[PDB]
């Protein structure tokens, strides 16, 4: 499969702020690079559908696009579910590879 | 799937005299007190008919594949219900559609399918010593029946399956003819008392069955019961049949006052 | 559409088998692969394998050969997975997902839009 | 219940009587068209449910992607249909009905294909792998009551027509008058009265000295009817 790298692993933000997360593929695919939002013990939702829209039903809080293998997506107003781990998946081949996982980190 | 049976004696066929048998009603017409001339296919009078015989005794098991030619005069004498169905077709295999008529002692099933027929098809009956009676026990006939085009099933009845000895009690005469895809079966049953070739007399068969089959028949096979109680366990019982062929002949048929054919003259038999 | 809901946690030791299956809801069950994804303690996801009930042959991750067997039955509406060759490093939450498809004419996307909550296997 | 799309069953119909006039005339039908035949005259019937757009696109001589992908028709016979929205549409969607998005080759006339085989779609060898630039060829539609005309399910039958007879029309038997008659296949003119003769059960017609057909068994109530010429 295509190797995925996702970062920052830990973001500094709080609810209502602007949060940017990026993910890069080893292969130049424009639309099969998408992120999920997961909490352990709860069913996750897909956040991004075919790069351009939001699967979870979110009213465009998040927006993004990519270039080459580099995909960037940002939320204008961070919500409590964005403290879930975001997982960047490349659905193109098998075994499906997911990135390391990222989230907003408050101590 | 079928069994290749042994202890079968190897003997030549017997031959007999068709006498005055071989007549059937040419059509569905009522005529009365008249001599009417027909040009249809009939068994010629005094024709040389082949005699086949199933008997326990050099156990005899006559179940060969025979020519169909232009139609078949078939008759059998039995008491034991050994002679049952028939297979008719061009190749008698799962290459083409073939016609299978089987009396399975429950009902009569007529099918047209690409049947992978066995060279030795059987309808076995076993003696159930703890019931002290004979019952259907083994059936194959074919290994497959693909792409079926026709089916007919008669209503349930009970056949007498008991093994029997001595004089045959019922003569079942049939004519199997096939015109433009229609398989026409003429038949009649009459009581008999014999262990020999066909008895003398005159009869005419009625057009009991007319089927939309669409099959070219070149060969056919007579299906016999397999009595048991291994490959040597096959009991022939005691039943016999006769096979002749129809030929175009002119007959002068005599209809009595109620439209029954009571007599006939074979116009090709004698100057008189 | 089908949110697949799984079996309860296993409290077995490493080397034991895991029996997990999910009950379908929604609709649209026989089409699109029923897949399974593993959630690492801490972070990280891996696909293990999946099957389309219509085709019936499945496809599996190389990383899970000897560990994951996946089947499904469109006539039962149940997703199934069994785990073997289990080790203590395989402590994880095991999830059902649906590979749900949308087609942009010529190009289609197959995503884990529906998900289960995950069955925890505590071998550690 | 109807054959689902791609679970088709073209039933052979033969050696029976059928009334196409009645099937045709019923007010319950949504659509009906014939190709070289007419239902007023009275063989296969392939009965299934598809979406309205496919109902309109799958027909003899009708070009379109789905016809080429499902059931291609050129034939002699009729195509009949009736909206099944209240049978097949379910709340939440009836997704048991697959439609073909991708295919290796097109169908020949009066030929159908129910295969679900994975297709590389000109690019990628999936071999059991999820459809990334290769596909599971079919995708279902959730028929739901809340749907448009092209999405409503319709029950559609492709009726090929030979091996099937229509009903026969009989009138009352009229006696002791000169009548222009037709008994089964026997026609002529004469006075029909009761006969004092009996026929064998299989004989249907009788004959005079020069073989004129005269006596006949009545087709519904077999009795011998006497046919004698008028003055
Ligand atoms: C039994 O008969 C079949 C034909 O129906 C033939 O193919 C098979 O070889 C025969 N077997 C033996 C042992 O003769
Ligand atoms: C023997 O009796 C059983 C019933 O207990 C019956 O099914 C079976 O057909 C009988 N016949 C033979 C040959 O055992
Ligand atoms: C004709 O049928 C009558 C009964 O209707 C019977 O009495 C008569 O003997 C029969 N004649 C012949 C030749 O069968």
Numbering used by the authors:
A (entry chain E): 1 to 107
B (entry chain C): 14 to 70, 76 to 247, 254 to 296
C (entry chain D): 1 to 52, 52A, 53 to 82, 82A, 82B, 82C, 83 to 100, 100A, ...
D (entry chain B): 346 to 387, 395 to 426, 429 to 515, 522 to 591
Passage from the reporting paper:
Mutations in the ACE2 receptor binding site on the surface S protein have been shown to disrupt antibody binding and prevent viral neutralization. The protective mechanisms for the coronavirus disease 2019 (COVID-19) vaccines are still being deduced, however, several analyses have found that the elicitation of neutralizing antibodies (nAbs) correlates with protection (Feng et al., 2021; McMahan et al., 2021), a finding consistent with many other successful antiviral vaccines. nAbs have been identified that target several distinct epitopes on the S trimer, but the majority of nAbs target the receptor binding domain (RBD) (Barnes et al., 2020; Piccoli et al., 2020).
CC6.30 appears to only bind the RBD-up state of the spike. Although the ligand-free cryoEM structures of HPM7 spike reveal a 3 RBD-down conformation, our data suggest that the antibody is capable of shifting the equilibrium by capturing RBD in the up conformation. The most stable cryoEM reconstruction contains 2 up RBDs, each bound by CC6.30, whereas the unoccupied RBD remains in the down position. Superposition of the RBD:CC6.30 portion of the model onto the all-down RBD ligand-free structure predicts that clashes would occur between HCDR3 and the RBD and N343 glycan from an adjacent protomer. A salt bridge is formed between the side chains of RBD E484 and LCDR3 R96. Finally, E484 is a major part of the epitope as defined in the Class 2 or RBS-B nomenclatures (Yuan et al., 2021a), consistent with our other observations for CC6.30.
